[PDB]
Every structure is written in structure tokens, then in C-alpha cells.
Design an enzyme around this catalytic site. Structure first.
Site, PDB file in Angstrom:
ATOM      1  CB  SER A 250       6.064  -1.043   2.378  1.00  0.00           C
ATOM      2  OG  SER A 250       5.218  -0.659   1.305  1.00  0.00           O
TER       3      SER A 250
ATOM      4  CD  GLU B  12      -0.494  12.863  -3.129  1.00  0.00           C
ATOM      5  OE1 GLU B  12      -1.313  11.917  -3.118  1.00  0.00           O
ATOM      6  OE2 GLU B  12       0.740  12.690  -3.198  1.00  0.00           O
TER       7      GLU B  12
END
EC number: 4.2.1.2
Lengths: 455, 455, 456, 456
Positions: free
Chosen positions: C315, C328
Site C-alpha cells: 500500500s 510463512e
């Protein structure tokens, strides 16, 4: 004893039972970690004492500890090793993940006891200090991992391996004895081509030999000791020769090839050596599970099962002989499989400079070694050495099977052989009965042609 | 005591220590199953006594046992329940998979003890018979499963659940207290949009409430008792009202909703109720694991970690407060996960009319209940009730983060807001410093516009 | 469609497919989930058929014309020409009989075409009589499993492991001089260099390598030749060693004939063991991945001692938020290997008499773990490890912010006094120096000369 | 190719594909193994986008033109028109951010075409601004996981479970009068009817059903509306309940908005729990499958009490050898569910603060287990259970061959005497009657009238 003794630490004073050799910290832990019933294993306790004994000897050799104080600590340690203070370690496994509390438990017991050995008294006016004297040049961080490996390696070498070798020898003897006994093979639980009982047991033998080698390959990593790395592995606050000398002393008194870990950061931050070593154990658990199952299925009966073999009846339905030894063994095999998961979870959960899942990891690891060693010893002496073949039953099964038709091929051809097989199977007859009903051969020819010994 | 007593069974005579209440079979087992150190749990032992006590009462009500013999057995059972004979059950968990040996252990101890209660003596000339009197209308096959469920249900209801409720109440109180304390959120371990500490803890609360319901849903299946099915579940050799009456008696003396299992074949052939009940426990272990980790990470520090909260220092590097309670809890959570695998393996291994992996299954199940109950009790009283927020640290973190830029959007637009965010991030400045350097707003406007309380 | 048949009769098979009646029959009987045989296993099974053909030919059991046609058809499978020809689910017969027949039919049909013949019942090469000559599903499937397993470990897993180790080794060397705060129990502890900390990761991977290498010899043992129950009934005495030699030749891996065929057929012991080393590697990687993402947490309210490459778009209004996606992905697949181990253990423990029939499931999990670990290390390496950089300012800020350095003062001032300033700093929220100076226990000059973090 | 772009710049995407820049970038960063998102999860994610569009439209946040276009594009995904449009591996970002963007881009590009627009940067519908309006990957992925999970359990698992139960219930009823020998510890024990034994299997499946049903309410809780950290920042107050209602409407399942969004985002607790019931079912099925194959073992040297349909062709010269293939397939997938449970447990226990980032792995294992159990029960049912038949002769032969019946004689002759003939039979290899008569303890007539197995 109701009478207390007032001991103290940095947090203050606390009452300790007068008849006990522990101190203030062991007492605080006792009251803070009242969780379940699991306490440190005796083998771990003794390994802790061995470690302290080695550190004392080396601290003396380096002039860090007085000869008198060091010999007293060394003597108190030997009493622990002799089993004289088993009642002095009441801490649960479920404590601080570094095993700091148990390290302090050993420091206090040896400090209070060495004091008495020097003509002193136990308590706050003792002659030997737990931290400054007994925990000299050490840290819980590098002491516990060291004690873990000492216990692990000795249990594998002195308990597990010897029992594995013994069972292997027993089965090997049985393999040779039943080498000429032809029996029906079973694949998918269905009747299959024949093989001797001896060949089948030789499979169990080779399984055990292979397991021995895998366990052996895991030993060198367990032989690496963390002692010398101190708090974070840098070896801050120690003598440059310490690490090497303490590993040598341990190796000498235990007669096991202990070496100081080449990388202390790996040694303190993980339980990798134990995660891997237990991998070999879960492998042996899988092999034993299969052997035990074969034994109980082959001995199932006496009339409505397989009944190819008989096993020693060890306890007091006439022929109903429950395979209890097989049941104990299969049960502990499941246990080892579960212990592996708990171990893997703890081993994968290290954070930064130290893995704080250690008491749980050593608890599970030593349990698996005890279960496997004792399990094999029990199974061997109470079952394996007395396995006997039921020759009549084996022969009956062979002769009632359709799997021997193959020997007719070279004599009367495949199509006629397959015809006989189909008839017997549809009509619920034996190959011989079907062969004779058809008139493809005489009984004498059948008796001469179908020799299961040439399978 | 060196002096022996000669007892005997169908297999012959064997020496039993004169000072012990067990018999010939318990002695044979003791010598045949020298495997590891695990013995039957006290809760299982007491459930076994409760079962025998119920069977005696019902056998009397049906006129199968004399009032005197039945009351004696009932009285001996109460002594076991009172903890007077804990030393009378030396059998390992690793025995016959049906738990036959432990059933016999209880039969012999109660027979020898009830004999004395009737003015008789222990040994081969006792007044009460282990098999004919104490094991009347029963079989190991239906007694052990019954004892397993009695222990399981009571431990869940009397130990586990209450502790779960207490921890829930503590966290709920903490949730309400810290409801107005805004802190920075973290997703993927990265700084994220704000939330109050109270909302974060409310997540822990709801987790515990949900776990309570799942555990509750598993209770009715555990409440089903196998008692009455005998050897293979048909109920051969019992009174048609027995099964129902014995379940009622148990329910009455324990005050737990016990019912006789609608299908005895399912009851004897599997440990399904326990496999499922433990599923809820591994679920709670996963939830507790997360809560404990959040607590220790949030309290990590004192200077180089997160440090948003402070926890009670329970033992004696100034601000170095190791989260020991969290470490014990996370360790036992891994244990429960492993126990589940051992349980699943044993539960899936039933053969025909009986599952013979029972001692191992109940051993693992009761351990998980103890670990969870005691773990929550310890964590609650030694950590949870004293959790305090570090308001200064929390505020500092909020103000140093880039995540508050969003409040500028409605005032100066997205593009200018994003510009300020980029500048601060590239230059290592605070949002306010970057905003002022640019001249997009005054400090007063910043102080008025960016109110983290309206997140 | 085309009409093929077997002992149970005829069945229509899609004309544009090379499989036969048995594969078609199985396709309708084992419709379970979506898992099929992985390419590496298909290739291994083809290689096994190729070797059996050469040896049968050498022993005078198969005509050169047929033997060469079978090998050619097999080479086409290795070349990726027939991937769509193996539709069978993993969840079939525990011995892998279906997949063995699937290969026999596909190979026989194609070998017919290659011989100017046609596919179908008019074919010149018989699946059972020719392609499956001197074999049995019982000894062929286990052999295919070991070939696939050994090759996957040697060609994929090990190289990736080494590469990742070399990378981390370069990093530790590069950051050998950066002193940082240690952490035990998640609390501030004594210092250690970033390089020392990374060296721990390296040592872990090096140990894992030797562990994996120790498992290879047992996996190299092939069951081929054991036939139905391990006796070798209906095989030439030299068949077992010959086919093992042939396979070693064409794969360039050290395959040998299993010393005991009974153990080879009745168990999956070699894989249960080899997988033990893999879950060990999974536990290590999990720790490494976690350290990386925790050390890179932030940017403002975490640890932030290191920075890792931002691979995904972010963003505009939220600069700095770099999620450790590779970490992850790696932690997730590590949890997967642990689960795969349990499934394999259960199957490995469930053999009965002469044959273990939990094989397709075992190999399905084993090959998946190798695949996960190999690709996982590659991805983590290229997309994360190579780009690990220290945030020197942040590291120093934390170092000079902790009270852990008070130990250096002890050697220059009584334990209690040194501890005294530490108490004040901690209680007042001051730094060691600010507290030391305010307490007047020393001057800035002597403090700075006493507290040397680079001297441990 | 076509050129798409994001905050990191532009990247070429295959022109014939509807995904965008972020999906293309991920395709190059997460090249791990072969596992992709399963269809049920893709559908659930589309359904989630469809519901979000309707609600956003209802709240006046999205124009009807765009909202309807998004829903239409979503219906095309459900209709199987875009399966090839989701190439992302399971092993990506732990929050499922990639897959969330993959759906947003595919849906935005197609929705543009549907509006007379074009795919690519010239598109009329914005993936982030439109398709992802009022959402976050953090609350969207967990929602998709629950939708996929609840629907899979309700539409696939439960119906198959019931069917298999009904079938076994018919069998127990049919064989209620066939008396057979019991077996404990694998040894001959007292008798029970075949129907009673099968009734045990039935009761097991019935219990499992209630266990699975108890896990549904927690899985029905949806995270949608919790947004980034659970606060619901940037959402209309009615958004959470509305979207939950919409989703319940279009799926016809009882979905509700999660009472606590913090628990919903920070954990995977509902699935860890629901999966507990599944591994429980796996343990039960394993026992049932094993009993079946052991009871059908033979034909001559096993137990052979029952016969099961022969589905695969067999050797002409080997009639009778019927391998229990469906039992092998079922036992294998059961071991798999056990392993899947461990992987899920590890991921479920690894959440940190506001978000659990082990999700793709968790849902990958969860959906696989449901898939395995549902298809496994169906296959076992149609290809095995429906055809279970007793071998009455064999059953009687074993019954009259065991010494277990001597118990009936006790009531007609002293324990020791009854035991006496049992000793002789056992020692001489004679049957109870032959031994009884030879011992002269009774006559054939009275023996037969005393030993009534049908009277237990």
C-alpha cells in the site's frame, strides 16, 4: 519431618524441610510448578551429577576451585550416582524450559552435602556455595543440554543397543532352525506362494540389523557436548581450554566418545541431535510393531485363527494363550510414535540463542529409550526364545491351499492346471481331489510332482 | 519385609511379600512385565475400586452375593478410595492390552482385605474369593473400559472444566479493565492497525469459552459405560437388569450422569469416546499454546523486545523476568499433541470384539487432563491474575509507528498523507516530524486529528 | 472409444488413450479425491520397466524386437510424452498393482505401434506376458518407490540444501563483526555477533546433510527379483543383480539388490527411516525461518534487527510493512512434513506377513515432503536469504539500550555498585551511562572505555 | 503477452489469461511443489466476493453496474468457466493474500469485459478499489476457509457417512441370526452373531456423526467484517451481519458473523477442533476396514468368515485370491488424515498476535481430509460394503471346531468334568463332541441338545 530450616536467595527467605538437602530456589520452584506428576528421570539426574563432577575436576585443574572444595563436590556427586539422594530432586518436568531449576536443584544439594563433607553444616552457613562453587564456569543454558546428551548417549549405548543385539541373535537362531519348514505366504492377507518359516523370520532379523546401523549413525551428533558455551554460546566467562577439557573428563569417566560441540550456537539453540536420534527410534518402533503383530497373528488360535506357531504361555478356555508380551510391545511402539511428535514440536520451537523446550524433550526421549530397551528385553526372554512351529497345522494349511497348483504346470500344462484350480475352488475341494476327480493324474504322480520344498 | 507368603493360581504357587495384600496373579505379572516406570494412575485405581464397589452393591441387590461378603468388599473398596492402599498396585501400564492384570490386582487386594474385614486372614485361606466374589458378573473386558470412562468423566468434570472456567473469568476481568488502552496491532509480525489491549484479550476469552462448549459436547459419549457386556458384549452370564442397575449405582455414588452404553459391541471393540474427547483436548492445547505465546512475546524485554505488558516475577540482569509459567504451559501443550497421536493409533487398532490397546490409551488421556487442568491453575494464579499493562511503553510504540497516518486522510487527503508516511519511513522520522518538516499541518492540528482512541 | 478386455471381460477405453482394460476398470473403482501418482514416481516406474526389458533380453527371455520397443516406449514416458496416460488415484490397492498395470498397458500398446502394430487387443506386445515378464506388482512397486526416493533426494533435496548452506555461510562471514543483543526465553541476554547467530543456522543445515546421507544406503536397496513373496520363484538366478546393475547404470545412482527380499517386501522401513531425517530437517528450517521473521519484525514496533527483500507490492500509504511471505510459506510446509511423518509411520507399522500394503500412501507422502523441502529451500534462498541485511542503527540502539552490558563494569567496580546503577537505570528508565553519570560513579570517558561490547 | 502493472511496476501476463500483475509476480516468487488451491476453496472465495458485492451495493458503496458485473463474473467461476485462472501454490503468504488478489484480478478483468470493457490496465473494474471493497485479505481468506469447510462437511462428508451407515445397518439386520466365534486378543472367545458384530460398526459411525455435527456451529462463524485486525475499521456497522446473511442465503447454510473477530482472525481454532472429529472418524473407519479384510482373508489359510466382491481381474490359475483393495485404499487414507491432523495442530498453535498466518496449509489439509473421507466412504460402500456376504459353511466349521462351547456343558456337568473333555480334545486334536463321546461322558444326542450356540 515438620521442622523447617530457613534458607534464602536473592528473593528472600523460605522454609525448607530440615531433613532435606535442597535450598531456597528448589523450594520456590516446588511451590510454583505443582504440575502433574512427572519429575526428572533418574538417568538425567545422574547425568547432571556427572556433569557437575567433571566441571569440578576441570575447575580444579585450572586452579579455579580449591582442591578441598572441589573434592568434596566430587564426592557428593558420587553419592548421587550411587543412588543415595534420589529423594532430593522433587522438581517436575514442567518447569522453566531451560531446566534452570533442576540445575539449581543439583547445585543446592551438592553445596549443602559437600559442606557437611567438609565438616560443615547444611543451610545458610554452609562451606560450599551452590552458585560460586558448584556452578563455577557454567550456566544452566550449557549445563542442561550437556546433561541431556550424556544421559541420551549412555542409555542408547548401555541399554538400547545391547538388547537390540540380543533379540537379533535369538531370531537369527530361530531363523536357522526353521529353515526347512515350508509354509504358505500371505500378501494382502491372502494365501500366496510358499516360503520357509526361516526365510520369513530372516526378514525380522535383517530389519533389526538395519535398525542397529541407523541408530549407530545417530550417535556421533549426540556425542557433541554444549558445555563451555555458557549463556549464549560465546563462552563468555570461561577458560579457553575449559570446553575441551571438560569434554575429555566426561569421556574418560563414562568411557563414551564425548566431544565438545564444534558449534556452540547450534548446541544451545536447538535439540537437533535428539530430534534426529529419535527419528531412528520411531523407525525401530515401526519395525518392532510389525514383528510383534506377525507373532501374535501367526500364533492366533488355537482353533479359529492361523495357529502356525506357538509362543510361551506366561500366565494362567483351554488353549487360549493371550499374546500379552506382543501387546505390551505394540503399545509402547505407539507411545514412541507420539513422543516423536512432542519432540519435533519442541525441537522446532527454538528462539534465538536458546531452545526453551528441553525438559519435555529429554523426558520423551529417555522414556522411548527405556520402553524400547526394556520392551525388547521382555519380549525376547518371555516370548522370542520359546517360539515353536506347529508343524501339523502348517502342513495342513499348505495341503488345503490352492497355491501349490503351479508345480503341475511343467507336467500337465498351464490350462489343465488352471482347470484343476478352478474346480477345487468352486467345489470346495483340495487340489488333489480335484485333480483325481478329473483324472488328469494319479495320486502317486501328484505326491511326486507337488513338492512344496522346491518353492 | 523379606518374609513371603505362598499364594497360588491355576498356574501354581508363587511367593508374595507377606506385608502386601495382592495375590499370585499380581505377582506373576509384576515379574513378567518389568517395563519402564509407568504404573496405573491413582484416578484410574480409584475408578476401578468404584466400579467394584458398584458391582458388589448390585450383586447384593440381585441376591448374587451375601450381604456380609458384599459389604466387606464395599468397605475394602472405600479404603482404596480413601488412599489407604496406594502401595498395593505395582503393575506397569505396559501389560496385557485389556487391562486384565490390573483388574486381577484389584480383585486380589479387595479379596485379601475383605477377608480380614470378616475376621479372616489374607492368603490362600481367605474368606472372600477374587474371581467368584469380587469379579462376580464381570469380565476384565467390560470392567476396564468402565473404569476408563469413570476416571475420564470425573477428571474432566471435577478438575479440567473448573480450572478452565476460572482462567476464563480472570482474562474476562482483565479484558474489561484494559478496554480503553489502545495499542498497535500486529499481523504477520508486522505493525498493523490499532486495537485496545482489552479487545485483544477478549479474543483469548472467546477462545476459552468456545473450548468449554466443545469439551462439553464430548461428555455424553464418555458417560456411556461398558459394564454388563462381559466378554464379547453379548452380556452372557449376567442378570438382565444388571447393566442398567450398575450404571445407576455408579451415577448415584459419583453424582455424574453415567448411563449404560446402548451398544456394548461398540463399547468393548473401541476407545472411540476417548479418541473423540481427546480431540477437544488437543484443540484446547492449541488455544492455550497461542495465549501463552502472546503473553510471553508481549512481555518480552525489558529493553530489547516488545514489553507492552508485565507479568508477576515468581523467582529470583535486573529486569530479566523469564516467563517460566508460559514455558511450562507451552511444553505441556506439545505433550497433549503427542498423546493424541498415541491415542489415535491405539484407538484405530481394535480387532474384532475387543480393543487391546487400553492401558496406553487411558495413560495418555488422564495425563493430558492432569497437564491441562494443573497447567491452567498454575498459569492463572502465578501469571494471569497479575498481568499489567506498560502504559508508557505502549504509548511510545503507538507514537513511533507509521500506522496512524490514516487519521490524516479525512483532513489533508490520501496523497499528502501517503507522502508524509513515505518521508518518515525513508528518513527514520515520526509521522509528526515528517508532517511538520513538510508543513502540511501544525503540531496542534496533528495532536487534534490523530486520536488513536477512534480506531 | 475402443474395446479392450481382460479376464473379467471387455470394457470401452477412450480411443485416444494408450491405457487398457485394467486401468479403465480401476478408474471406475477407485474414484477417491484428486491425488494421482506424481511424475517422479511415473518416471521411476518406467525406468524400472526399461531395466527389466534389457535384462530379460540379455537372459534370452525376451526378443530383441520387443525389448527395444518396450525401452523406446519407456523413454517416451521419461520425455514427458505420455503424462496424460496415468489417471489412477493414489488411493488404490496397497501394493500399487493398479499403477503397475497402468504402466504395463500403456507401454504394451505404444510398443505395438512402434512395431508397425496397433493399440488395443490387436497389439503385438502383451502387457502381462511381455512388459511384466519376470516381475510382480509386489516387487516392482517397492523398487519404483526406492528409485524415485533416492533420485529425488540426490538430484533435488541435497543440492538445494547445499546451496542454502553456502548462502548462509557467506552471510555469517559478512556479519562476523556486527555485535547484537542475545535473547534467551525471549528476554535480553548477553551479546553475540550476528555472524555467530547465523553460524548456528549453518551448523544445523550441515548436520542435517550428514543425517540425510546416512539414510541413503538403505533406500538404495531394491526389491526387484523378490517376486511374489520374496523367494524369487520364477526368476533367473542372475536376474536380481543384473537388473540392479542396469538400473544403477541408467540412473547413475548406486542401486543394489536388497540383501533380504523378505524385509524389502514386508516393510517400508527404509522410507520410515529416511523420512525421520526429513522431519528433522523440517524442525531445523522452522527455527531458522522463525528467527528470520522475528528479527525482521517491525518496522517500528517489533525487533527490526534485519531487513529482508520486499517481493510483493504494498500500500502506498503504508510504506515499511514488509510481510515475511517466504518465511510463512516455509513454516507452513514444515508443519506439513511433520504430519506426513505420522501418516508414513502408521503405514510403515501396518505391514502383515509377506507384504506391506500401505505403499501408494507412503510414497505419496514421502515424495511430497522431498518436493516441499527442496522447492521450499530454493524459494527461501533466492527470495529471502540472499537478501538478508542488518539494520545497523537499530542493532546498536538496542545494544546501548539494554542493561545487559553492566557486566563489563563489574571488573572495574564492585558487583553491588555496578548493579546499583543498573537498578537506577531500570527504575528510572535511563540508560546504563545516563544512570552511571547521574549516580556519579564514573565519567563518560571511563565508562565508554570499560563497556566494550565488541569484547563480549 | 499483455502488460499489467502494480505499485512495483509492470509485468507481462499471458494475454489469454484473466489474472493480473500481482498473480503473475507471485507465480514467480512461490514456485513450491505442485499443490494449488482446490476447487472448493476457489468457489468459496468467489462466493465470498459475490456476497461482498451485493452488500456493498445495498449500502450504496458500489454502483449497481459494477456490482452486478462482479457477481456475474463470480457465477462463471462457480460454473467452472475459469478453473485455469488460479495457478497459485498453497505455499504462499500465510494469510492467503496472493489467492485473495488472484480472485480480485480475475474478477475485475472479466467484469470489465462483461461491461463492454477490456481486460488489462484499461479495465473498467478495479480489483482493489472495487472487488476488494470493504475487505482485507485478513478477514476474507478465513471466511472463504469456513465457507468451503462447512459446505464440504454438509454436502459431501455427512451424506456419505449416512449412506454407509444405512448399508451396514441393513447387513447387521440380515445377518442377525448367524452365530460366529468371538475373538479377543486375536484368540478364540465366546460366540456372538455376525449381526451383533456389524452393529458395533454401525454404532461407531452413528456416534461419529453426532461428533461431527457438534463441530459445525463454530465453523459457521465468519470473520468477514473484522477487517485488518478485527476492529472492523473502515466498514459500515451493518456490513458484517449483512454479508453473513447474504452468504447464508446463497449457500443455504446457517452462516453467522463471528461473535469475536479477534479470535476469528488470530486463530484457526474452529478447524483444529472440527478436524479432531475427523481424525476420530478416521480411527473408526480404520478398525471397520481391518475387520472386513481380516474376516475375508483366505481363501484357504486365513479366517474366511465372509466374502467380498472381486472388483479387479485375477490370474486364471489362481482362483480365489481376492485382494481387499477397497480396504487397502481406505486404511491408507485414514493414516493420511492422522498425519493431516498433526500439520493442522502445529499451524493452529502457531498464531501470533492479531493474525494466524499458517492458513493455506491448514485449509489444504482440512479439505483434503474431508475429500478423502467422503470419497473413501462412497467407494468402500459401493465397491465393498453392499456386497459383504457370509461364508456360512466356514463360519459353522470354525464354530464347531473351537473348544469355547464347553461352557454350555458346565450347566449339565461339573466344571472339572466339562473341562476334562476340553483338555482331551485340545491335547488329542479332537473336537468337543468327539472327545466327549470317546471319554464316554455323554451321548451324541444329549451333547447336541446341551451345546446350543444360538443361545449364547
Amino acid at each position: 519431618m515438620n521442622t523447617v530450616r530457613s534458607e534464602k536467595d536473592s528473593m528472600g527467605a523460605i522454609d525448607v524441610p530440615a531433613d532435606k538437602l535442597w535450598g531456597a530456589q528448589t523450594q520456590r520452584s516446588l511451590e510454583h510448578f505443582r504440575i502433574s506428576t512427572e519429575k526428572m528421570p533418574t538417568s538425567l539426574i545422574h547425568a547432571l551429577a556427572l556433569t557437575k563432577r567433571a566441571a569440578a575436576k576441570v575447575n580444579e585443574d585450572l586452579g579455579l576451585l580449591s582442591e578441598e572444595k572441589a573434592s568434596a563436590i566430587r564426592q557428593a556427586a558420587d553419592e548421587v550416582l550411587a543412588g543415595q539422594h534420589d529423594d532430593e530432586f522433587p522438581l517436575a518436568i514442567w518447569q522453566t524450559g531451560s531446566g534452570t531449576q533442576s540445575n539449581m536443584n543439583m547445585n543446592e544439594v551438592l553445596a549443602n552435602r559437600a559442606s557437611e563433607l567438609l565438616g560443615g553444616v547444611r543451610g545458610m552457613e554452609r562451606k560450599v556455595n551452590p552458585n560460586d562453587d558448584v556452578n563455577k564456569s557454567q550456566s544452566s543454558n550449557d549445563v542442561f543440554p550437556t546433561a541431556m546428551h550424556v544421559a541420551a548417549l549412555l542409555a542408547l549405548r548401555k541399554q538400547l543397543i545391547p538388547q537390540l543385539k540380543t533379540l537379533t541373535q535369538t531370531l537369527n537362531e530361530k531363523s536357522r532352525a526353521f529353515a526347512d519348514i515350508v509354509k504358505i505366504g500371505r500378501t494382502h492377507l491372502q494365501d500366496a506362494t510358499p516360503l520357509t518359516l526361516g526365510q520369513e523370520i530372516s526378514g525380522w532379523v535383517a530389519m533389526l540389523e538395519h535398525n542397529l546401523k541407523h541408530i549407530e549413525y545417530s550417535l556421533p551428533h549426540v556425542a557433541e557436548l554444549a558445555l563451555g558455551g555458557t549463556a549464549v554460546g560465546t563462552g563468555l566467562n570461561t577458560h579457553p581450554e575449559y570446553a575441551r577439557r571438560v569434554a575429555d573428563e566426561l569421556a574418560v569417566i563414562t568411557c563414551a566418545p564425548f566431544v565438545t560441540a564444534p558449534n556452540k550456537f547450534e548446541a544451545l539453540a536447538t535439540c537437533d541431535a535428539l530430534v534426529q536420534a529419535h527419528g531412528a527410534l520411531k523407525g525401530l518402533a515401526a519395525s518392532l510393531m510389525k514383528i510383534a503383530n506377525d507373532v501374535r497373528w501367526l500364533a492366533s488360535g488355537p482353533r479359529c485363527g492361523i495357529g502356525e506357531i506357538s509362543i510361551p504361555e506366561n500366565e494362567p478356555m483351554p488353549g487360549k494363550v493371550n499374546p500379552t508380551q506382543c501387546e505390551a510391545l505394540t503399545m509402547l511402539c505407539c507411545q514412541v510414535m507420539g513422543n516423536d511428535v512432542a519432540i519435533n514440536m519442541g525441537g522446532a520451537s527454538g528462539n534465538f540463542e536458546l531452545n526453551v523446550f528441553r525438559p519435555m524433550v529429554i523426558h520423551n526421549f529417555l522414556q522411548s529409550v527405556r520402553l524400547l530397551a526394556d520392551g525388547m528385553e521382555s519380549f525376547n526372554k518371555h516370548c522370542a526364545v520359546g517360539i515353536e512351529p506347529n508343524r501339523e497345522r502348517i502342513n495342513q494349511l499348505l495341503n488345503e491351499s490352492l497355491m501349490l497348483v503351479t508345480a503341475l504346470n511343467t507336467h500337465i500344462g498351464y490350462d489343465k492346471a488352471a482347470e484343476i484350480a478352478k474346480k477345487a475352488h468352486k467345489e470346495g475341494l483340495t487340489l488333489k481331489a480335484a485333480a483325481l476327480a478329473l483324472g488328469y493324474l494319479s495320486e502317486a504322480e501328484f505326491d511326486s510332482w507337488v513338492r512344496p520344498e522346491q518353492m
